[PDB]
Design a protein around this ligand. Sequence first.
Ligand code: SF4
Lengths: 286, 289
Amino acid sequence: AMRQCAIYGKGGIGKSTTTQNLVAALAEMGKKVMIVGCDPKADSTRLILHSKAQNTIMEMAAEAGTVEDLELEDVLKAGYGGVKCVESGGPEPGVGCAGRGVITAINFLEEEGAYEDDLDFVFYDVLGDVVCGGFAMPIRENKAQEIYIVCSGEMMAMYAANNISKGIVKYANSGSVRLGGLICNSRNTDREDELIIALANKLGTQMIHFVPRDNVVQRAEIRRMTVIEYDPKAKQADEYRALARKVVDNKLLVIPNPITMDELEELLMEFGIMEVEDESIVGKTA
Amino acid sequence: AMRQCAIYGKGGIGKSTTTQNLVAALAEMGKKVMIVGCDPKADSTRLILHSKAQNTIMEMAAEAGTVEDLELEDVLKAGYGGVKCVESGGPEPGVGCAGRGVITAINFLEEEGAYEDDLDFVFYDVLGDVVCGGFAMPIRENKAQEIYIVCSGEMMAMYAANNISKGIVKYANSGSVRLGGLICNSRNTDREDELIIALANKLGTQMIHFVPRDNVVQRAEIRRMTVIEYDPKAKQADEYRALARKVVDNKLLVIPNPITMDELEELLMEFGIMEVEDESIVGKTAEEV
Ligand code: SF4
């Protein structure tokens, strides 16, 4: 039947691009997928739809008075491989919870039966700069059971994974939401794959795939398309295909073991990222 | 006339180092300052204390278990230049609003009237990756009147600056929140300064200062300190003194005019940051065209 998944991760590391490329490979693979973007910014579906900006449930809800009038064919658009797409949107900056649009989107897609009309996978593309309120909603309310975290060999990207992992632990007994693995969005750093393999193993999970940097990505993106649709013969298309296959066959769905800041700093030092703390040099620079 | 300000900015671009070096320069100027870090991670005060990490309210509100119970000795540590350094901390991921650490910290400080105890400036150091009721609090409750936005010539940093501006807009009437200007932390991008100047102009504000990249910052950072206390005779040290004096003497506090996504992307394109889309090849595979 359908598997409800979610790709979580900090902003600015190529997450939405990795999600849409993984989803296109799934669709190329024969799977029927729906992406539910949850970033207030709404940039989780444009490569599937070759679009400027998809109209968000929130923008619309603010138009015909409320979300009761909203039509499903106006909210959900289909694109490459038949992948269905919806954007939650979000409130105006500073007004309430920035990630609440998800609750509005999920509740609407529910009433409209969207989740039963031929779907093998549902992927919520959620931000993880903070894990609270609307952002933690797909986990809290047991809306996505298979969580895959996008990260890179950088402090903040790693910190976010840890806190998201924390969020999963907190709702452990709450449902069947579990961590399926870390996806490394390479930032062309030395020993980056090793660094994430190191953290995933420390978390009690797996680095399900290391996504290399490759210009073909931007060449595909400038045309509002995924690498799978733009250049199927490319080396990078295979990478997304590999990820897709492992996600499809994934069996490792665990309750993570959140590390501590010191461990975090340990991996970073250990892998050529952070420098070992000199000591005579502190407190009284000169 | 104690001035309450806030430095907002996207994370990952040295904002806190700028806030701290800014406050240090201010301190050297003989100004009495206090930094309220409102970042979950809590790195808004290390450089001032020469610490690895300062204890937050949240953490020690989970020791005594009750919001109020921490004389400013264990919670409010004064460090370099007499700058009082405090940290809000945040709650556990999934435990209520992450802005609980902020909303807490202030009331607590207003309860000890730490604001009234010999102070010229208070700077809340807040992250702008998420502009929601939780983190817009200082603005919303009228806790911070003078806002300064740290940004760089990059998409998210400028997007974050526009969103902070939207939040300033929203409350410009209920209180006296105003945007003092943009602070560009250079990330070594061409035309970065001119891009931010341009953005300042569009937003209807000013780029109060361009903070350059100087390895003496990373140098003094390792020492767990500011560039000011480190080597006050550094060329970079003078950039903070300059920014500081413009902050002290800033008359220009305005209500920002946010721009649309087009205007922003427009800006980004004319400065060579964002690629101009070729309409014809959109949705065509590499073999087709
Ligand atoms: S729960 Fe988080 S995203 Fe929501 S308003 Fe609070 S701090 Fe912001």
